[PDB]
């Protein structure tokens, strides 16, 4: 009160300095039943994948793809993600989640890069510049290697032009390189493009193939279908906490509900458009939303000349969490005895700390509100105020009390009639003698005209009020000497 009221002497009354807040604690996070299970097990656990003349541009849609199982698969060789990190792959997704599959030879996996051609990037599969998505290579030695070489994945090393990025290269006809045409029977310049990967068990680990799937992410004007999964906590109840459900969020208290939602909603609103109830998408249970409580501090003093003790009122707050509504562990031990103690009380206005309730009724001296006042009788007391003396004086149909003695006393009555006149000049108050600011201020039109004409009006009207209140006499009258 000494710092806020700009004094060292504070007169008896009620004062408001600050407020108090209760804080979120756990920051709970919920997501629905993710649980849709895209068919990626057949493109992660099969013994014969697609070919490089037949790598299908398959649309996997309307499910979810887990990528946290990919990091703990314990077999990956050249896990590559362009554009976005694979650490934040699972939480955030994009549209156009088209997928590819081939068992590429492991010698030139590193040539598949934006801005780098080769013979795998030139005749098998090319990545565009600024790729968003992942290309995922792993060791697959134990399954695609039969006796004498696994000749199941034929490939192309011969084609007319360079690859367009993400191009379906399917052909049976042969490469043209000379001028003499082929006659069906293969000749010296026929150049059959479909030769064989030799995938023998005697090959080295760089020579044994690296099995690639492509999680390409494009951006067209179509909504997304397949994303990564979402991890979710549990929900805490009857506590001020931050929440984040499936799209909607806030800070508040989750309690049990009593109203009946229809089976299609997930939340509710009220009059003037604020949320008040929510249904969780993993239990289908309606939970009421209560905001975290707050209020301002009201401090009661009988005057700095009189006492040094104070009384503290926390308004419209339940009087149990008032030490943990404040940061009583962070403040002084002086503030700690005004957060807990024997002298606790709950009023209709709120929780009062620093006074004891008195059953007796006295005259009100300090206005708190809702009938309770406080005073000092050497400790601070709390009491419901007394209206005055009761009177039941005897009604009689044939008796009158008539006074026979008289009192002459007078009563002061004070009213203010006038004001000290104050006017301001607008222009160099606003600018402070700047040429371009004054060229700005006349260019705000004529605000100075209404301003000076209204602030002349207070002075001239106050002059009329003084002229009315103190001139109702024609002359100057004088008393006898």
């Amino acid at each position, epitope marked *: 009160t000494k710092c806020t009221l700009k004094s060292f002497t504070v007169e008896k009354g009620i004062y408001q300095t600050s407020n108090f807040r209760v804080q979120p604690t756990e920051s709970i996070v919920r997501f629905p039943n993710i649980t849709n299970l895209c068919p990626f097990g057949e493109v992660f656990n099969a013994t014969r994948f697609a070919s490089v003349y037949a790598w299908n541009r398959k649309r996997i849609s309307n499910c979810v793809a887990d990528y946290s199982v990919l990091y703990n698969s314990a077999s*990956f*060789s050249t*896990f590559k*993600c362009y554009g976005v*990190s694979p*650490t934040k792959l699972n939480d955030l997704c994009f549209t156009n989640v088209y997928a590819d599959s081939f068992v590429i030879r492991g010698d030139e996996v*590193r040539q598949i890069a934006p801005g780098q051609t080769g013979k795998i990037a030139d005749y098998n599969y090319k990545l565009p510049d600024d790729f968003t998505g992942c290309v995922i290579a792993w060791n697959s030695n134990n399954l695609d290697s039969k006796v004498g070489g696994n000749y199941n994945y034929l490939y192309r090393l011969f084609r007319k032009s360079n690859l367009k990025p993400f191009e379906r290269d399917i052909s049976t006809e042969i490469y043209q390189a000379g001028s003499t045409p082929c006659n069906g029977v293969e000749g010296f310049n026929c150049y059959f493009p479909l030769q064989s990967y030799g995938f023998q068990p005697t090959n080295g680990v760089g020579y044994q193939p690296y099995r690639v799937v492509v999680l390409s992410f494009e951006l067209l004007h179509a909504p997304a279908t397949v994303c990564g999964p979402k991890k979710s906590t549990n929900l805490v109840k009857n506590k001020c906490v931050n929440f984040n459900f499936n799209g909607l969020t806030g800070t508040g208290v989750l309690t049990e509900s009593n109203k009946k939602f229809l089976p299609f909603q997930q939340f509710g609103r009220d009059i003037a458009d604020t949320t008040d109830a929510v249904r969780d998408p993993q239990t289908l249970e309606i939970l009421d939303i209560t905001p975290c409580s707050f209020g301002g501090v009201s401090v009661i003093t009988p005057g700095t000349n009189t006492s040094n003790q104070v009384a503290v009122l926390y308004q419209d707050v339940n009087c149990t969490e008032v030490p943990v509504a404040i940061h009583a562990d962070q403040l002084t031990p002086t503030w700690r005895v005004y957060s807990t103690g024997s002298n606790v009380f709950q009023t209709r206005a709120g929780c009062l700390i620093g006074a004891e309730h008195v059953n007796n009724s006295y005259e009100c001296d300090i206005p708190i509100g809702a009938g309770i006042c406080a005073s000092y009788q050497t400790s601070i007391i709390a009491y419901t105020m007394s209206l005055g003396a009761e009177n039941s004086v005897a009604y009689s149909n044939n008796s009158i009390a008539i006074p026979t003695n008289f009192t002459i006393s007078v009563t002061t009555e004070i009213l203010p009639v006038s004001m000290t006149k104050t006017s301001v000049d607008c222009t160099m108050y606003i600018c402070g003698d700047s040429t371009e600011c004054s060229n700005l201020l006349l260019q705000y039109g004529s605000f100075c005209t209404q301003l000076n004409r209204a602030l002349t009006g207070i002075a001239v009207e106050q002059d009329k009020n003084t002229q009315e209140v103190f001139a109702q006499v024609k002359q100057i009258y004088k008393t006898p000497p």
Partner: nanobody
Amino acid sequence: QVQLVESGGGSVQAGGSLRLSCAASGSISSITYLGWFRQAPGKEREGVAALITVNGHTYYADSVKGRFTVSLDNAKNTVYLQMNSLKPEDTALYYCAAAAWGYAWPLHQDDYWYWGQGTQVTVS
């Protein structure tokens, strides 16, 4: 955004052990793959050891397998490389490298690496 300052080099005889440390400063949370490089005099810079910060999975080269190990210390944001059973074919400039683009084995020079300043490891 990733700066690497390493130490732990020095001189030791055959049969001894040293302990390389590479400290990371800056974007620690984007670092997902820590690889250790090695360039012999007259030979190309190759790969020795590898570590994933997300998974803890180690990829080891064939000439250092059974003798060389890598460990992660996230309290000091430092990666540790312990070289036991040293032989004089390991005398080379040892490099630590960080990746914010994923994990890839074997290590390749053409990839995007945040490099270290280099400590000389000498054994005879």
